[PDB]
Design a binder for this molecule. Structure first.
Ligand SMILES: [Zn+2]
Ligand SMILES: [Zn+2]
Length: 185
C-alpha cells in the first residue's frame, strides 16, 4: 500500500498504467518516429474506488514537428471523451532523436494538464536513445513558475527546479490491464 504526496503536501491518488501502453503507443506512432516526427497521444480512463485507471490511449488529430506536437481538433476529442465518460489522466509523446527530458514547450503543455488534475502525468518516449520517463511539475513551486512564465520564445529556459519524475514506486503504478487505442485521424 502506497501513499504519495506533492511537494506542498497534497495527497496523490494512484494512477494505474497499462504495462503494454508505452510500446503500443510507440508502435502506433512508428510512422512518425521513423519519419522523425513528434507524435502525442492522450491518456484517458475512469475514476473507480478513489483511483484512476488508464483505459484508453486516444491519439488526437495533431500537427507534428521535430520539436512539438499540439492537438489540432480539441472538439473531436472532447466529443469522444464525453461520449464514453473518460477523464484525461495525462498524455504521452515521442522525442524521435532527442533525449528523455521535459522540453520548454513540454512544461507549459503539462502545466494546464496538472492544473485540471493534480495527479496528471506526462510520459516521454525517446525511441532512438531507448529511454522513457514519466514526469510531473513540482506542486506548487513548479506550477507557480510556469503559470507566471509569460516569457517568449519556445525553448525559453526556466528558473530553478521546475519538474520531477514520478517516483518508483509511486502514484503511477504499472499493471497488466487491457488497453484500447483510439486513433482519431
Ligand atoms: Zn517533448
Ligand atoms: Zn516558460
Amino acid at each position: 500500500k502506497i501513499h504519495a504526496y506533492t511537494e506542498g503536501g497534497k495527497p496523490l491518488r494512484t494512477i494505474y498504467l497499462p504495462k503494454l501502453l508505452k510500446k503500443v503507443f510507440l508502435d502506433v506512432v512508428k510512422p512518425n518516429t521513423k519519419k522523425n516526427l513528434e507524435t502525442c497521444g492522450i491518456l484517458c480512463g475512469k475514476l473507480r474506488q478513489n483511483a484512476f485507471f488508464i483505459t484508453h490511449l486516444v491519439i488526437p488529430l495533431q500537427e507534428a514537428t521535430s520539436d512539438a506536437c499540439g492537438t489540432t481538433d480539441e472538439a473531436s476529442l472532447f466529443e469522444f471523451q464525453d461520449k464514453h465518460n473518460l477523464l484525461t489522466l495525462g498524455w504521452i509523446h515521442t522525442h524521435p532523436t532527442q533525449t528523455c527530458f521535459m522540453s520548454s514547450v513540454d512544461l507549459h503543455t503539462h502545466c494546464s494538464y496538472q492544473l485540471m488534475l493534480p495527479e496528471a502525468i506526462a510520459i516521454v518516449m525517446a525511441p532512438s536513445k531507448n529511454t522513457s520517463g514519466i514526469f510531473r511539475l513540482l506542486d506548487p513551486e513548479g506550477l507557480q513558475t510556469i503559470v507566471k512564465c509569460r516569457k517568449p520564445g519556445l525553448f525559453h529556459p526556466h528558473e530553478g527546479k521546475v519538474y520531477t519524475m514520478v517516483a518508483q514506486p509511486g502514484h503511477v503504478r504499472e499493471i497488466n490491464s487491457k488497453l484500447q487505442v483510439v486513433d482519431l485521424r
